Structure 1
């Protein structure tokens, strides 16, 4: 590189030649992905359309759900325990619609997901057991995201993808037979303000809304009156970026760009 003349030239050579980065078809070779959600419903709301397209292409999609959804009701006669048991069933039914056959429930309490080594170890045991080719999680840099379970899921997902590759990290996994997580897998962040890869979900939008409504405890009619237009407006926001009606947006970067990189806004 010592002979390239300008930063602009170096950036393009680094991104395309050295890091081999392009977003033409980033999920192309995937056989198994994890979709990590803060609460029951986040995978389908954030990326339901893409989940169905992945299942249709013969990719095995597996959820990891960080919390139980215990707090998500204003009904005073429904305890958190009873809601959590109801929402496990809602998510099973929603997942069947999208082709998902396996969900890891971590069972942290809703509004209480910790931000700790302990939670990275839980994600790391699943990464190491399943060895996915790709991991989806919320973008923890989304502006004004006020829910701590969402920010923490996104930070702990990215951290655990990196650290789970390290054999001195949670080393008792390796002592019981698991290998470090394989290198070469992608991360794609949903619920992002800065998507650089859009999936067109226009003909899948009605199925995605149906699979969201199956979470009935969350979406009774009065709430749906505000949420349906909200969810459609979000999908148009992403779809407009590639000139289709409804889209799901993801942010994808080279691994090196998640650290010390001062020009992440160029992609």
Structure 2
């Protein structure tokens, strides 16, 4: 498009006409979504209110849990194996409150999620099988995010969504009858410091906190005394951006902006 005079015009038209980027109803046509969490409890903590709205709308929400949450206890009589078995049941109960009926467990060990082609292949197999319309994952660019399983889950989610569409990537999936990932309409990153789309969850907030507290091994009373205010305050930070009390924030960009794009901060 050789005749536009200003960057600001080129940018507006690139987004609205060339890429048809829309932040007004980005989940509009979604029939099936995957919600990718590093640990058991992260989908509900990051976006439980939105999962419920999606389910209320008849969207099929499927979790993919990267790790088993093996390490998340300070109880010296509770082994990692026993804790992982308990957290699987806690996630099932939590997910059921939010209308989720399927969880893919990848079973990597908590604190030890690899950053590797292998983990991309696991995600790629699920994407190719399920062909979701949209995928949710943490923002790996969150500053001061000190948990490796978080940063890696975000990177590996975005990478797999792109690479799962290439037939020479993990080519054995196609040899067993799966198609390339054909169907996706969006990625939405939660746990983000740069949200550009907010779901009002004011009405849903008590359901969210309830479904979070179902992860009892994680949230005994003394930890909840700190975590409840922390989670309320995060929801208010997001809410305020659309003038509501409580929200969940997502960063959504056109697919090209995830590569070589020097003006990602303009959205």
Q: Please state which band the TM-score falls in when normalised by the shorter chain.
A: over 0.9
Q: CA deviation at 1:184?
A: 4.2
1:22 is displaced (CA, Å) by 1.4
Q: Helix, strand or coil for the counterpart of 1:203?
A: coil
Aligned to 2:52: 52
Aligned to 1:97: 97
Which position in structure 2 is the counterpart of 1:36? 36
Deviations, residues 83-109 of structure 1 (Å, cap 9, x unaligned): 000000000000000000000000000
Of 131-140 and 178-187, the range deviating more from structure 2: 178-187
Q: Note the alpha carbon deviations across 1:179-219, whole angstroms, 9 max, x for none.
A: 00014420000000000000000000000000000000000
Instruction: Tell me the secondary structure at the aligned position of residue 204 of structure 2.
Output: helix
The answer as to whether partners of 1:198 and 1:239 remain within 8 angstroms in 2 is yes
Query: What CA distance in whole angstroms lies between the structure 1 residues aligned with 2:128 and 2:183?
Result: 11
Q: Is the 8 A contact 1:124 1:161 kept in 2?
A: yes
Cα RMSD after superposing both structures: 0.5
The 10-residue stretch of structure 1 (180-189 or 76-85) with the greater mean CA deviation from structure 2: 180-189
User: 2:132–2:184: 8 Å Cα contact kept in structure 1?
Assistant: no
1:110-259 alignment runs, 5 A limit: 110-259=110-259
Tell me the TM-score normalized by structure 1: 0.99
Contact 2:69-2:87 within 8 A present in 1 as well: yes
Equivalent-residue separation in structure 2 for 1:205 and 1:14 (angstroms): 37
1:250 Cα deviation (Å)?
Answer: 0.1
- Provide the rounded CA distance (Å) in 1 between the counterparts of 2:96 and 2:254: 32
For 1:86 and 1:185, the matched residues in 2 are separated by 35
Moved over 3 A (4+): none
CA distance in 2: counterparts of 1:20 and 1:28, whole angstroms: 14
Alignment deviations for residues 104-138 of structure 1 (CA, whole Å, 9 cap, x no partner): 00000000000000000000000000000000000
CA contact (8 A) 1:135 1:186 kept: yes
Inter-partner Cα distance in structure 1 for 2:204 and 2:88: 24
Q: 1:51: how far off? A: 0.1
Counterpart secondary structure, 1:3: coil
What secondary structure, in the 3-state scheme, does the structure 1 residue paired with 2:198 have? strand
User: For this pair of structures, how many residues does the alignment match?
Assistant: 267
Offset of 1:6 from its aligned partner?
0.7
SS across alignment from 2:105: strand
CA–CA distance in structure 2, aligned partners of residues 177 and 258 of structure 1: 29
TM-score scaled to structure 2, two decimals? 0.99
